[PDB]
Design an enzyme around this catalytic site. Structure first.
Site, PDB file in Angstrom:
ATOM      1  N   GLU A  46       0.462  56.379 -68.460  1.00 17.30           N
ATOM      2  CA  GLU A  46       2.001  55.914 -68.601  1.00 17.30           C
ATOM      3  C   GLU A  46       2.799  57.061 -69.220  1.00 17.30           C
ATOM      4  O   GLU A  46       3.834  57.193 -68.442  1.00 17.30           O
ATOM      5  CB  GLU A  46       1.900  54.794 -69.560  1.00 17.30           C
ATOM      6  CG  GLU A  46       0.796  53.670 -69.065  1.00 17.30           C
ATOM      7  CD  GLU A  46       1.355  52.301 -69.572  1.00 17.30           C
ATOM      8  OE1 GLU A  46       1.183  51.921 -70.814  1.00 17.30           O
ATOM      9  OE2 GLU A  46       1.692  51.453 -68.869  1.00 17.30           O
ATOM     10  N   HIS A  54      -7.128  49.541 -75.833  1.00 24.40           N
ATOM     11  CA  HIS A  54      -7.107  49.380 -74.431  1.00 24.40           C
ATOM     12  C   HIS A  54      -6.715  50.520 -73.783  1.00 24.40           C
ATOM     13  O   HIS A  54      -6.409  51.537 -74.225  1.00 24.40           O
ATOM     14  CB  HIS A  54      -6.398  48.136 -74.084  1.00 24.40           C
ATOM     15  CG  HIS A  54      -4.704  48.623 -74.008  1.00 24.40           C
ATOM     16  ND1 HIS A  54      -4.103  48.096 -75.529  1.00 24.40           N
ATOM     17  CD2 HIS A  54      -3.866  49.218 -73.459  1.00 24.40           C
ATOM     18  CE1 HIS A  54      -2.921  48.818 -75.232  1.00 24.40           C
ATOM     19  NE2 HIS A  54      -2.691  49.272 -74.036  1.00 24.40           N
ATOM     20  N   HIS A 111      -4.842  42.292 -66.966  1.00 21.02           N
ATOM     21  CA  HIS A 111      -3.990  43.248 -66.856  1.00 21.02           C
ATOM     22  C   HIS A 111      -4.742  44.566 -67.415  1.00 21.02           C
ATOM     23  O   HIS A 111      -4.418  45.729 -66.848  1.00 21.02           O
ATOM     24  CB  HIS A 111      -2.683  43.215 -67.698  1.00 21.02           C
ATOM     25  CG  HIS A 111      -2.036  41.735 -67.442  1.00 21.02           C
ATOM     26  ND1 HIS A 111      -1.337  41.744 -66.046  1.00 21.02           N
ATOM     27  CD2 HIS A 111      -1.596  40.754 -68.187  1.00 21.02           C
ATOM     28  CE1 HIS A 111      -0.604  40.630 -66.204  1.00 21.02           C
ATOM     29  NE2 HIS A 111      -1.037  39.964 -67.305  1.00 21.02           N
ATOM     30  N   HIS A 119      -4.745  53.499 -75.578  1.00 21.31           N
ATOM     31  CA  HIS A 119      -3.741  53.167 -76.547  1.00 21.31           C
ATOM     32  C   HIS A 119      -4.339  52.357 -77.772  1.00 21.31           C
ATOM     33  O   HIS A 119      -5.230  51.197 -77.615  1.00 21.31           O
ATOM     34  CB  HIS A 119      -2.673  51.944 -75.855  1.00 21.31           C
ATOM     35  CG  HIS A 119      -1.822  52.839 -74.828  1.00 21.31           C
ATOM     36  ND1 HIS A 119      -0.982  51.973 -74.026  1.00 21.31           N
ATOM     37  CD2 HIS A 119      -1.437  54.070 -74.836  1.00 21.31           C
ATOM     38  CE1 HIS A 119      -0.300  53.127 -73.179  1.00 21.31           C
ATOM     39  NE2 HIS A 119      -0.576  54.126 -73.980  1.00 21.31           N
ATOM     40  N   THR A 175       4.589  48.755 -73.184  1.00 18.37           N
ATOM     41  CA  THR A 175       4.667  48.999 -71.811  1.00 18.37           C
ATOM     42  C   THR A 175       4.393  47.954 -70.986  1.00 18.37           C
ATOM     43  O   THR A 175       4.169  48.134 -69.685  1.00 18.37           O
ATOM     44  CB  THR A 175       4.018  50.404 -71.593  1.00 18.37           C
ATOM     45  OG1 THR A 175       2.443  50.119 -71.814  1.00 18.37           O
ATOM     46  CG2 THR A 175       4.383  51.485 -72.425  1.00 18.37           C
ATOM     47  N   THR A 176       4.102  46.861 -71.281  1.00 14.89           N
ATOM     48  CA  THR A 176       3.843  45.494 -70.901  1.00 14.89           C
ATOM     49  C   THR A 176       4.982  44.587 -71.131  1.00 14.89           C
ATOM     50  O   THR A 176       5.239  44.554 -72.456  1.00 14.89           O
ATOM     51  CB  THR A 176       2.433  45.230 -70.901  1.00 14.89           C
ATOM     52  OG1 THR A 176       2.281  44.738 -72.282  1.00 14.89           O
ATOM     53  CG2 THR A 176       1.328  45.943 -70.180  1.00 14.89           C
ATOM     54  N   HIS A 210      -5.058  52.322 -69.859  1.00 12.63           N
ATOM     55  CA  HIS A 210      -4.383  52.253 -68.373  1.00 12.63           C
ATOM     56  C   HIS A 210      -4.968  53.165 -67.399  1.00 12.63           C
ATOM     57  O   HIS A 210      -5.294  54.309 -68.230  1.00 12.63           O
ATOM     58  CB  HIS A 210      -2.766  52.310 -68.716  1.00 12.63           C
ATOM     59  CG  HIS A 210      -2.310  51.645 -69.546  1.00 12.63           C
ATOM     60  ND1 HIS A 210      -1.635  50.251 -69.154  1.00 12.63           N
ATOM     61  CD2 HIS A 210      -2.269  51.690 -70.838  1.00 12.63           C
ATOM     62  CE1 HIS A 210      -1.085  49.716 -70.301  1.00 12.63           C
ATOM     63  NE2 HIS A 210      -1.465  50.560 -71.395  1.00 12.63           N
TER      64      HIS A 210
HETATM   65  N1  LIG Z   1       0.582  49.199 -73.472  1.00 10.16           N
HETATM   66  S1  LIG Z   1       0.649  47.694 -73.989  1.00 10.16           S
HETATM   67  O1  LIG Z   1       2.026  47.161 -73.558  1.00 10.16           O
HETATM   68  O2  LIG Z   1      -0.425  46.908 -73.342  1.00 10.16           O
HETATM   69  C1  LIG Z   1       0.546  47.448 -75.467  1.00 10.16           C
HETATM   70  C2  LIG Z   1       1.294  48.163 -76.619  1.00 10.16           C
HETATM   71  F1  LIG Z   1       2.247  48.936 -76.089  1.00 10.16           F
HETATM   72  C3  LIG Z   1       1.496  47.714 -77.875  1.00 10.16           C
HETATM   73  F2  LIG Z   1       2.339  48.369 -78.698  1.00 10.16           F
HETATM   74  C4  LIG Z   1       0.617  46.426 -78.534  1.00 10.16           C
HETATM   75  C5  LIG Z   1      -0.037  46.076 -77.664  1.00 10.16           C
HETATM   76  F3  LIG Z   1      -0.927  44.997 -78.080  1.00 10.16           F
HETATM   77  C6  LIG Z   1      -0.404  46.281 -75.899  1.00 10.16           C
HETATM   78  N2  LIG Z   1      -1.420  45.787 -75.443  1.00 10.16           N
HETATM   79  C7  LIG Z   1      -1.735  44.467 -75.390  1.00 10.16           C
HETATM   80  C8  LIG Z   1      -0.854  43.444 -74.783  1.00 10.16           C
HETATM   81  C9  LIG Z   1      -1.177  41.862 -74.837  1.00 10.16           C
HETATM   82  C10 LIG Z   1      -2.604  41.630 -74.762  1.00 10.16           C
HETATM   83  C11 LIG Z   1      -3.581  42.670 -74.409  1.00 10.16           C
HETATM   84  C12 LIG Z   1      -4.720  42.665 -73.781  1.00 10.16           C
HETATM   85  C13 LIG Z   1      -5.249  43.551 -73.186  1.00 10.16           C
HETATM   86  C14 LIG Z   1      -4.983  44.858 -73.526  1.00 10.16           C
HETATM   87  C15 LIG Z   1      -3.862  45.192 -74.107  1.00 10.16           C
HETATM   88  C16 LIG Z   1      -3.080  44.260 -74.577  1.00 10.16           C
HETATM   89 ZN   LIG Z   2      -1.017  50.179 -73.304  1.00 11.32          ZN
END
Ligand SMILES: NS(=O)(=O)c1c(F)c(F)cc(F)c1N[C@H]1C=CCc2ccccc21
Ligand SMILES: [Zn+2]
Length: 257
Positions: free
Chosen positions: A103, A91, A61, A116, A195-196, A93
């Site tokens: 986002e 990470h 993703h 993020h 956001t996922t 987007h």
């Molecule tokens: N923007 S997001 O939903 O991806 C996000 C948040 F908004 C947050 F508060 C904490 C998180 F760890 C993640 N991202 C991770 C979610 C699962 C594993 C993973 C793998 C690759 C990149 C991001 C992430």
């Molecule tokens: Zn994110």
């Protein structure tokens, strides 16, 4: 499973994750005229001097640069936060075109990408337990626009060919996330969510006003990543953003003006 397409993208997520229609979902449009300057907010304290990156990983993703968060190292505090939040990963987007990818939006403007930096509140002991609490996580969000290159980003871009596909990771040590920050720490903040999926409502969002510039060549490298795993049909990893969600009862606060 979930993803970003027609038949599994954001408009479908609510079926597996009903909180997608919740009261504090993210991202949102930041209407800058409506955001309230809050003179009681504090400067953010971003203390990244001892950050220890470990791996960089593609999960199908996005990709995420990970940190050793077993010690009191790279921490976020101040601003709207009570207590200490420890950096666990960052990470991005991004879009298929330079005109979309973020986002959050600012007066409906979409940036090319959004970074993020994810942090968990140390009072909950682990990131996973923190994710179950309404003040468990703090995400520092930073917009990317296309222009001059960001030198501190290049180490990340140059490893992406080694993680092209879902599930690939690489030894990614000694990466300094201070090289991804803009000059100013002026910000907007509001209570929101992942956001996922699973879209947990556990995030204090801190969105910096000042974008960083990355070059066209840097963002083209993001767009060469794949949402598929090795030996599966190539799906370019692009447009991995959730659009803005209803603000509902919420107020966005500004640290400035
Ligand atoms: N923007 S997001 O939903 O991806 C996000 C948040 F908004 C947050 F508060 C904490 C998180 F760890 C993640 N991202 C991770 C979610 C699962 C594993 C993973 C793998 C690759 C990149 C991001 C992430
Ligand atoms: Zn994110």
């Amino acid at each position: 499973h979930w993803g970003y397409g027609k038949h599994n993208g954001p408009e479908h997520w609510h079926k597996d994750f009903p909180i997608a229609k919740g009261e504090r979902q993210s991202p949102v449009d930041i209407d800058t005229h409506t955001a309230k300057y809050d003179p009681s907010l504090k400067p953010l304290s971003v203390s990244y001097d001892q950050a220890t990156s470990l791996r960089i990983l593609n999960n199908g993703h996005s990709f995420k640069v990970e940190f050793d968060d077993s010690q009191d190292k790279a921490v976020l505090k101040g601003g709207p936060l009570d207590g200490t939040y420890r950096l666990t990963q960052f990470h991005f987007h991004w879009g298929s075109l330079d005109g979309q990818g973020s986002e959050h939006t600012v007066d409906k403007k979409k940036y090319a990408a959004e970074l993020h930096l994810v942090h968990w509140n140390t009072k909950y002991g682990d990131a996973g337990k923190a994710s179950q609490q309404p003040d468990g996580l703090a995400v520092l969000g930073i917009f990317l626009k296309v222009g001059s290159a960001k030198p501190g980003l290049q180490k990340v871009v140059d490893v992406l060919d080694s993680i092209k596909t879902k599930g690939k990771s690489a030894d990614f040590t000694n990466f300094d996330p201070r090289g991804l920050l803009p000059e100013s720490l002026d910000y907007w903040t509001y209570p929101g969510s992942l956001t996922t999926p699973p879209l947990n409502e556990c995030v204090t969002w801190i969105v910096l006003k000042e974008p960083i510039s990355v070059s066209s060549e840097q963002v083209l490298k993001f767009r060469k990543l794949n949402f598929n795993g090795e030996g599966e049909p190539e799906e370019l990893m692009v447009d991995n953003w959730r659009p803005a969600q209803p603000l509902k009862n919420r107020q966005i606060k500004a640290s400035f003006k």
